[PDB]
Amino acid sequence: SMEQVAMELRLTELTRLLRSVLDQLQDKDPARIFAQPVSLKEVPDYLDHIKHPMDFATMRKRLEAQGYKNLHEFEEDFDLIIDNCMKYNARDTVFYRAAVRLRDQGGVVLRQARREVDSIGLE
Numbered sequence: 001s002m003e004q005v006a007m008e009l010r011l012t013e014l015t016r017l018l019r020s021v022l023d024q025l026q027d028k029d030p031a032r033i034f035a036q037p038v039s040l041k042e043v044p045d046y047l048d049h050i051k052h053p054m055d056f057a058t059m060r061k062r063l064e065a066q067g068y069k070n071l072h073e074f075e076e077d078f079d080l081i082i083d084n085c086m087k088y089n090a091r092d093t094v095f096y097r098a099a100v101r102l103r104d105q106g107g108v109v110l111r112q113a114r115r116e117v118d119s120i121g122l123e
């Protein structure tokens with residue numbers, strides 16, 4: 001149908017916007033602490049602590065499959081990256097501190113992203 005095509009165009013445009021958002025968020029992690037999944041070889045007990053692991057590479061996979069239907073779903077995954085890190089790691093670690101900085105700097109980006117999604121009407 002023409003409607004389904006229109007819906008798919010909207011999703012494709014959302015995916016384009018979120019790809020820009022993802023790139024901006026990841027630029028706020030130049031240490032690449034959050035770039036890849038935590039290794040279960042190097043941290044074998046990780047899943048005892050963290051029930052829903054997340055990282056930028058896993059987000060990018062979902063994004064390119066157009067698996068984010070709205071900005072809320074994308075934000076949920078970003079918050080998982082931050083929140084998982086701040087539970088597993090103590091306050092005095094480079095990991096926890098990187099997550100705080102990413103959260104703070106990311107908030108700016110996500111604030112305007114919400115406005116753009118609402119304005120352009122992409123969801």
Ligand code: NA
Pocket residue numbers: 086087088089090
């Ligand atoms: Na903790």
